[PDB]
Design a protein around this motif. Structure first.
Motif: not given
Ligand code: PLP
Ligand code: PLP
Lengths: 292, 291
Positions: A172, A177, A208
């Motif tokens: 997260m 997502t 995260i």
């Molecule tokens: C953005 C991101 C996430 C998590 O995605 P969300 O949809 O924002 O929860 C995880 N890992 C990395 C490397 C990211 O850039």
């Protein structure tokens, strides 16, 4: 084919060697297949396209956001693609490697002080969007972020598993997502446990963060996540290294974490079909030395 | 899916802002979409799969190859994926970024001396293999390299353009890509001009080189390339930077050269449908400052 149409519809690939061998399958959603190399291309597309539909922006305009990771790269790319002027704000404490990924797409980088930090940039970025000198994307509070995963990611995972998925595991960040996917999964008849992951207290995992119970992104619905697990930085880093070596999957530290969590979920559930999100490729991690 | 099933069927995307606006179209075949980030995944899969078909190798065995770029990454990936133990040879001239990519897939790196350099690595590599020490791959003479492009890359381009392609532009490294796509294009009803690009006299562009007319790869058939245009290193670099800024295409220097070549071709041919190979993503190029 238009860079836009290459966003999403990413592969889902089963682990062949790692994990328990107790009936459970663990599949990987390779978000690194997105044009600019991460799951962020999805939310960046959605936020921009939906803003266009609302009359908020037109190709000449400036877009603004406080961020310096995959979100910055994603926005800068979408900005280059659709013809916007990206302005990205971040603390003046970044590798010339991270900054260069964003700069290559022509994004203007506004450095902020080591002392106003990440929190400062969100504030500065907010000030500018009042002033009328660009549209703030506000990735933590913008419904269109999770709408991208409700609309695309979730349906894809459901179609790619023929509905057999039983658990979904996402590290997260903004939570777009996991929110977007859980939302979609709740609409189906058969049940699907949703498992979010965050760093242990001491840990540092580039994509995260550990969220305190008040600072939660405005997008988050705590009732959409059935269970939250902690990930030691070291287990994420090992699992990441292991992934490349034993599976051919070359991803970042969060993704290592996601597979670690997915494996823990598989150890505890015999006939599970766990789907984990692999957020990006390992390429932009190489210079930080975490491989070795 | 399986990881090898995500090799190929890469996107083909049209240039929207760059290029002449005389009715011509330029389309980019995004080989960076391959799992390990380059066109080399196709040749790597093929050389190993056909070696398996011929019973020369088996998941436990050890593979050898003298290379220090995308081929090494690709091979190490296929080795990690299919079960082999890659051994990869190169000068100790190469930076941590290059090694780390290959080492990450768990490949052994036999470092070799700056002097007895690239050609010495090719040499040392050679005659570990007739021992039974390991299967040499030999990407410069292995027919399975262009065979990958003959069966996948070319057919895909044909299908993706609905037969409308008039020119194919490819920067030549092993030349597997250009020769494989050519064989396929020559089997077709209408004529397709085949355009190889090589670097100009003094220019250096990572995955390619100026082949002297006697060291040409054994897979290379000069009759399959209709013309060869030279690319100045500065023009490849400018075009690479321009692609990211103006199109959102983030690719390497050879890919910039590919597009510069394809723009030259489109400038001169008012209703050409040119496709250029984009060999990889820009990611592994960032730490060289070329962006
Ligand atoms: C953005 C991101 C996430 C998590 O995605 P969300 O949809 O924002 O929860 C995880 N890992 C990395 C490397 C990211 O850039
Ligand atoms: C391999 C490669 C090429 C050329 O492809 P061939 O099929 O070997 O001609 C061009 N650029 C880069 C970066 C490569 O790795």
């Amino acid at each position: 084919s238009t860079l836009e149409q290459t966003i999403g519809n990413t592969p889902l690939v089963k682990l062949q060697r790692m994990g328990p061998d107790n009936g459970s399958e663990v599949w990987l959603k390779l978000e690194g297949n997105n044009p600019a190399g991460s799951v962020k291309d999805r939310a960046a597309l959605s936020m921009i396209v939906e803003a266009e539909k609302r009359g908020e922006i037109k190709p000449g305009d400036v877009l603004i956001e406080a961020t310096s990771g995959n979100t910055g790269i994603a926005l800068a790319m979408i900005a280059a693609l659709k013809g916007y002027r990206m302005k990205l704000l971040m603390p003046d404490n970044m590798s010339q490697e991270r900054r260069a990924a964003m700069r290559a797409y022509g994004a203007e980088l506004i450095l902020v002080t080591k002392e106003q930090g990440m929190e400062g940039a969100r504030d500065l970025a907010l000030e500018m969007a009042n002033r009328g000198e660009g549209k703030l994307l506000d990735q933590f509070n913008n419904p269109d972020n999770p709408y991208a995963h409700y609309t695309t990611t979730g349906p894809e995972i459901w179609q790619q598993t023929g509905g057999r998925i039983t658990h979904f595991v996402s590290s997260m960040g903004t939570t777009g997502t996991i929110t977007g996917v859980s939302r979609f999964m709740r609409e189906q008849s058969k049940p699907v446990t949703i498992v979010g992951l965050q760093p242990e207290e001491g840990s540092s995992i580039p994509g995260i963060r550990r969220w305190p119970t008040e600072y939660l992104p405005g997008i988050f619905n705590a009732s959409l996540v059935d269970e939250v697990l902690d990930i030691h930085q070291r287990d994420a880093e090992n699992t990441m290294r292991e992934l490349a070596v034993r599976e051919g999957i070359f991803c970042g530290v969060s993704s290592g974490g996601a597979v670690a969590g997915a494996l823990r979920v598989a150890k505890a559930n015999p006939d599970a079909v766990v789907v984990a999100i692999i957020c990006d490729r390992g390429d932009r991690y190489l210079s930080t030395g975490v491989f070795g």
